[PDB]
Amino acid sequence: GDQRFGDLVFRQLAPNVWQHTSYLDMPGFGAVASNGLIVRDGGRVLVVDTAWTDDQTAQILNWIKQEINLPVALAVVTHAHQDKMGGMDALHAAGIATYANALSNQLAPQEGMVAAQHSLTFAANGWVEPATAPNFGPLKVFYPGPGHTSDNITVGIDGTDIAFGGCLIKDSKAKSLGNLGDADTEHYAASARAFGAAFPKASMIVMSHSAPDSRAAITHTARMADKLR
């Protein structure tokens, strides 16, 4: 189930969807896993999130070449922290078009990240403005509101039961919300609930720092973010 490829782990979640996992030692926390997604859409591949580093992100591209062997048409990254955007330069070196929330691109320099090439913007109801996410295929991008960070976005995969909450959602048995230093403590709980309502039929909830879980991850995250207000 978990395919080891160098220092990374890959897990198939659906016929056209894989989870990528990479690790970084955070002095004081251990070797922290971060998950993203790889989606085959016909003759091309779409990536959600980089790995922590450029070298690890180049290894994701090597795994794609070996296991799928189709071009990577684009990548979308889900907020301006290192586990999601740390490997942007590796995507750009490979010629891959990159997308992030306009606010993630604004924050990227001060957070120590390289910005994506393209900015997503969002309607008042949270759905991406379609002209900013051209050729996204089955990826449905949703801004649920500020939570884990002000810029966090989420992604559903059409044709599957999968929705990706990134670092906004923790699993059913998590004991805390993790890194809160950039969090919007007032709005976190509402944002987690908005993610769940945006993808009401997703039964497999993928997230950055836990293995895929049921919809119980969303309400546990929400039932827990209430504590920060």
For position 41 contacting ligand EF0 by CB under 6 A, the verdict is no
Interacting span for ligand EF0 (CB under 6 A) from 15-23, 78-86, 87-95, 132-140:
78-86
Q: How far is the CB of 33 from ligand EF0 (least distance, A)?
A: 8
Ranges of H-type helices in the chain: 54-67, 82-85, 88-93, 102-111, 188-198, 216-225
Q: Is the dihedral of CA 117, 180, 205, 163 positive or negative?
A: negative
DSSP 17-38: EEEEEEEEEETTTEEEEEEEEE
For position 151 contacting ligand EF0 by CB under 6 A, the verdict is no
Q: Is the dihedral of CA 194, 196, 199, 205 positive or negative?
A: positive
Q: Is 167 annotated as a binding residue?
A: yes
Cβ-in-10-Å burial (0-12, 13-18, 19+) of 133 comes to: buried
Report the SS3 class of residue 219: helix
Q: Which residues pair with 104 in a beta bridge?
A: none
Which residues from 44-63 bind ligand EF0, rule CB under 6 A? none
User: Based on CB atoms, which residue is closest to ligand EF0, 83 or 213?
Assistant: 83
Q: Is 209 annotated as a binding residue?
A: yes
For position 32 contacting ligand EF0 by CB under 6 A, the verdict is yes
Six-digit token pair at 138?
């089955």
Q: How far is the CB of 34 from Zn ion (least distance, A)?
A: 6
How far, in Å, CA of 222 to CA of 152, rounded? 15
Contact with ligand EF0 (CB under 6 A) among 11, 140, 209, 215: 209
Contact with ligand EF0 (CB under 6 A) among 117, 132, 172, 179: 179
How many CB atoms are located within 10 Å of the residue 85 CB? Answer: 29
Q: How far is the CB of 66 from Zn ion (least distance, A)?
A: 27
Q: Where are the beta strands (DSSP E) in 130-185?
A: 139-142, 154-157, 162-164
For position 82 contacting ligand EF0 by CB under 6 A, the verdict is yes
Contact with ligand EF0 (CB under 6 A) among 178, 212, 215, 228: 178
Six-digit token pair at 24?
């970084």
User: Based on CB atoms, which residue is closest to ligand EF0, 45 or 100?
Assistant: 100
Q: Is 79 annotated as a binding residue?
A: yes
Residues of the shown chain interacting with Zn ion in the complex, contacts defined by CB under 5 A: 81, 83, 167, 208
The residue written with tokens 């992030």 in the block is 100
User: Based on CB atoms, which residue is closest to ligand EF0, 83 or 151?
Assistant: 83
- Which residues are annotated as part of the binding site for Zn(2+)? 79, 81, 83, 148, 167, 209
Residues lying near ligand EF0 in the complex (CB under 6 A) are found at 32, 81-83, 167, 178-179, 209
- Which residues are annotated as part of the binding site? 79, 81, 83, 148, 167, 170, 179, 209
